[PDB]
Amino acid sequence: AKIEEGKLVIWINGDKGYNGLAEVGKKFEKDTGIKVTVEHPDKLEEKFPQVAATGDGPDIIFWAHDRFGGYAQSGLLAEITPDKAFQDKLYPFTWDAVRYNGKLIAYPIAVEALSLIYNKDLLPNPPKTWEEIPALDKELKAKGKSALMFNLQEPYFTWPLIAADGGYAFKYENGKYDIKDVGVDNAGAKAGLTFLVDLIKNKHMNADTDYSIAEAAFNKGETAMTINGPWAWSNIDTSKVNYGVTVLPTFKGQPSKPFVGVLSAGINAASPNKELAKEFLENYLLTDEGLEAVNKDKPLGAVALKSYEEELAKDPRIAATMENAQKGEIMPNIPQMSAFWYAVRTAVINAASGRQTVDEALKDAQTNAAAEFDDVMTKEEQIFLLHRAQAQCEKRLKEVRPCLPEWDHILCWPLGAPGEVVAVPCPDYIYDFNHKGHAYRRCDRNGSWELVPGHNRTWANYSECVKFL
Amino acid sequence: LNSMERVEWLRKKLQDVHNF
Ligand SMILES: OC[C@H]1O[C@H](O[C@H]2[C@H](O)[C@@H](O)[C@@H](O)O[C@@H]2CO)[C@H](O)[C@@H](O)[C@@H]1O
Numbered sequence: 001a002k003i004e005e006g007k008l009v010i011w012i013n014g015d016k017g018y019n020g021l022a023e024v025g026k027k028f029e030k031d032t033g034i035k036v037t038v039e040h041p042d043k044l045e046e047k048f049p050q051v052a053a054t055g056d057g058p059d060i061i062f063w064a065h066d067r068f069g070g071y072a073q074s075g076l077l078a079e080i081t082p083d084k085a086f087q088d089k090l091y092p093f094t095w096d097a098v099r100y101n102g103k104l105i106a107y108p109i110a111v112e113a114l115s116l117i118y119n120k121d122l123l124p125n126p127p128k129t130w131e132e133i134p135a136l137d138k139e140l141k142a143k144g145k146s147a148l149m150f151n152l153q154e155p156y157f158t159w160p161l162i163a164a165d166g167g168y169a170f171k172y173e174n175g176k177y178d179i180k181d182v183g184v185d186n187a188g189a190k191a192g193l194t195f196l197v198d199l200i201k202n203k204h205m206n207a208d209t210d211y212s213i214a215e216a217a218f219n220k221g222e223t224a225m226t227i228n229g230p231w232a233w234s235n236i237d238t239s240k241v242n243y244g245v246t247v248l249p250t251f252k253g254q255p256s257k258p259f260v261g262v263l264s265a266g267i268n269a270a271s272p273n274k275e276l277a278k279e280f281l282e283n284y285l286l287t288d289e290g291l292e293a294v295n296k297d298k299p300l301g302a303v304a305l306k307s308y309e310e311e312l313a314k315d316p317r318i319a320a321t322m323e324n325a326q327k328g329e330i331m332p333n334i335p336q337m338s339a340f341w342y343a344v345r346t347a348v349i350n351a352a353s354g355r356q357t358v359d360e361a362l363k364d365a366q367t368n369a370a371a372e373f374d375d376v377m378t379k380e381e382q383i384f385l386l387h388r389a390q391a392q393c394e395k396r397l398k399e400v401r402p403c404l405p406e407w408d409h410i411l412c413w414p415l416g417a418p419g420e421v422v423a424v425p426c427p428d429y430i431y432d433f434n435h436k437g438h439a440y441r442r443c444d445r446n447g448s449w450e451l452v453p454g455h456n457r458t459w460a461n462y463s464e465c466v467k468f469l
Numbered sequence: 470l471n472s473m474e475r476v477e478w479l480r481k482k483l484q485d486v487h488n489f
Contacts, residue, residue: 371472374471374472374475375470375471375472376471377471377475378471378474378475379471379474379475379478382475382478382479383478386482408486408489409482409485409486409489410482410483410485410486430479431475432475432476432479457487457488457489458489460486460487460489462483462486466483469476469479469480
């Protein structure tokens with residue numbers, strides 16, 4: 001399908017309820033005469049930014065919210081205009097996930113998180129810890145089964161383990177995700193990835209396992225557990241496997257932390273059907289009946305629409321989804337997310353296949369991601385940002401016992417209490433600084449900034465700020 | 470490229486701070 005005025009083309013991932021969505025499309029056509037074509041191309045999230053400029057995109061694209069900041073920076077999304085009454089129908093935190101630089105850039109549909117799914121006939125009590133899986137697999141192999149199979153090809157599925165003991169994508173500091181502060185190669189990420197690679201080393205899992213392989217093995221009853229989202233429940237229902245959905249195992253006593261996605265619908269900037277797309281999304285899809293149709297095809301998870309979520313919340317499988325979601329973290333939607341995922345994808349694949357050691361693979365991923373992020377800001381921009389901060393300090397200085405404000409060439413010091421150590425967060429406007437650190441001065445009992453013995457120098461300690469250099 | 474230029478500038482800025 002190609003875009004045409006007076007009809008709608010919608011893209012959604014092949015794991016989602018595209019047939020349920022087409023039923024919503026059918027009702028839209030019945031009512032309005034506007035034909036709706038739903039497609040599920042492979043790699044649609046990469047394809048969209050490639051083909052939009054040629055006029056080969058959809059009118060509406062569905063994906064988890066994490067990709068949308070990138071699309072918005074590239075000018076590929078139309079602005080959406082839900083009035084206040086409409087916005088009030090959805091949970092505020094679902095709107096937050098689709099807010100980029102203060103604008104709503106897509107409609108939220110549903111909250112997704114991975115859970116542990118287990119076969120109750122093979123395993124009545126699911127393991128509480130990752131650590132106990134190796135012995136569980138040993139026991140099951142003897143009966144011609146395996147403990148656990150999940151998609152190892154996509155970092156989304158391995159992340160919850162990587163994050164458990166301390167891995168993170170970007171640090172949130174000073175009211176934003178700090179792209180200088182990337183947590184892909186710290187001790188926590190390395191611990192989690194090592195545990196995974198050890199499972200492979202010890203033949204508890206196979207490095208080649210992908211989504212379809214894992215799904216079939218669980219649904220055929222060949223493996224005791226899988227890790228998957230709410231969309232997978234339908235096929236399990238069909239297979240008649242006796243299954244439960246539960247909290248992911250802990251690692252080193254800590255919860256697994258899945259990255260939480262809000263499935264969202266954005267409108268192509270190049271669509272001549274923006275008003276029809278709005279009508280479809282607000283008045284047909286985002287209704288009790290619209291979401292039920294999609295949900296009955298493949299479960300959406302916790303829907304963004306409050307009225308319908310209030311029903312679905314009583315489902316124990318949704319209760320488990322929300323439990324894992326709260327233990328996890330909502331994904332950033334910043335443009336840097338695709339580069340983050342690429343780096344982790346490569347790191348996991350390389351570690352799992354033995355191409356690299358765990359430490360090499362994550363160091364490389366961290367290095368390559370950071371190389372890209374650290375190239376954004378020019379010297380000229382960085383000078384401009386410091387100059388702005390200087391002009392602010394000079395304002396504060398003009399408006400002036402405690403120590404007094406002064407400019408030290410990088411930061412404006414505040415008042416300091418007599419005889420005290422003064423700590424100032426490492427300034428946000430210095431791109432390369434560590435922003436979870438503080439710079440330090442000492443204030444005299446006499447209300448003068450402490451000097452360096454045998455110098456006219458003022459003492460300051462910026463060692464925490466320079467952590468990354 | 471940008472990163473090298475920017476960090477180099479900051480090291481010189483960190484040094485003005487030290488001299489202050
Ligand atoms: O594996 C990286 C991948 O993770 C997320 O994609 C998920 C998606 O959110 C789910 O809805 C489901 O379709 O599984 C996908 C993983 O195959 C991110 O949304 C995506 O951007 C990222 O590349």
